[model samples]
Target: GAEQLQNSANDDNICIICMDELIHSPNQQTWKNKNKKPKRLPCGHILHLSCLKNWMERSQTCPICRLPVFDEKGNVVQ
Candidate 1:
């Protein structure tokens, strides 16, 4: 039943760029550490906030859809 699949979770909940699970661990060291949560792009794709910041350095477009990204304030990058 669908109820049985509730706990059948795995590492599929991961950031596309860092390839790390979308969860903050107790320890903090890597980019996947605390505060570096997942952020959604305009194209509905998700990536680590740190990864998105780094990615924006190269281009403000989504890696999967190539659509422009917006900031937290909702301003579209030109």
Candidate 2:
């Protein structure tokens, strides 16, 4: 069966905040990271775990646009 991508309430498109496509139902990651957790970036772009880890160590901006991704609090929520 084909799974339909979930639409975010913030906007019609998927949440760029987490970089992971929203699921029609709650997903493990989303369920695990409830309130007080870092919401992740909603840039509509996805990256591998290792890739992001290396990128974060090397730069503070998004790999695609060099945009400042972290907030003043140093969280990864954008």
Candidate 3:
């Protein structure tokens, strides 16, 4: 589930969150989206928006690279 954010041209990638298919940009069917959308972490890792957002409550680093999750935001905020 870690280090799974390697860039790829193949449209097959999984988010380390639930280790499930990252799926399409706009899920065609009723995908099991917690937040109903994906999130782009600054460390280049992408995941379920609510997944990492919830994860942020406990940890402030990318689950893949352990880099500061705030890389996308100007700073951590509540």
Candidate 4:
């Protein structure tokens, strides 16, 4: 079971929003249903919890590409 968890896009490598090398450690966790997570923007990215939160709080766009990630309401799209 734990092994399967490691295979997810958010598990052990790569930036979910950039598809590049994860800039940090895995720092993963479990949840009810990860597939239901929200989608990223501009770059059409996607990420786990902390990964997205850390990025979005600093800038409302895809980090690597600098694409806009939200409208005025701070939603995930422009």
Candidate 5:
């Protein structure tokens, strides 16, 4: 998703779900290669691409803002 590439939040902050740093931080590289990159949700909030998918499997909202995640089409992000 292009949204995933737009946010630089990964460079200085943490992935809320993992509560882990996005830059120079260890872990998650196992199978998620470069998954530490940030994703900007429709709500304008940011978090890791990896963490977003992990949370999306169980819920439909942004963890940081509690706003529903959606694609530009106005459909729920899947």
Candidate 6:
């Protein structure tokens, strides 16, 4: 329900990759920091966008769950 969605959107969630809080300022300054925005993987693990990009180069699977990460098009990453 909407309640569950709202709970999941909270900044209290932390990214396992960078160990940083999942929420941050949406201002351009924060976006330029390269490690502030949170990105959720197909495996339900969250990571900073920069961290995710780096991890993708190492392995297409989720660092925490070993599940394949999907691209924006919904296909498994090669």
How well does model 2 score by local distance difference test?
0.47
lDDT of each: 0.62, 0.47, 0.62, 0.50, 0.62, 0.62
Residues 1-78, candidate 3: write the lDDT tens digits: 455466533322566666657655453643554573656655676776767676777777877767766833437677
TM-score of 1: 0.54
Q: Which stretches of candidate 2 lie over 4 Å from their true place?
A: 1-40, 71-78
How high is the lDDT of residue 53 in model 6?
Answer: 76
Give per-residue CA lDDT, model 2, range 11-61, as digits (tens): 322434445443333444543434323334556444444445556676755
Clashes of each: 0, 7, 0, 1, 0, 0
* Winner by TM-score: 3
Clashing pairs in 3: none
Better of 2 and 6 by lDDT: 6
Deviation of model 3 at 1, angstroms: 13
Tell me the TM-score of model 6.
0.54
Span of ten consecutive residues with least summed lDDT in model 6 = 1-10
Worst 10 residues of 5 by lDDT: 3-12
- lDDT per residue for candidate 5 within 1-78, as digits (tens), equals 355533544323667676676543355443356575766665566677777777887776776667757643336444
**Which residue pairs show collisions in model 1?**
none
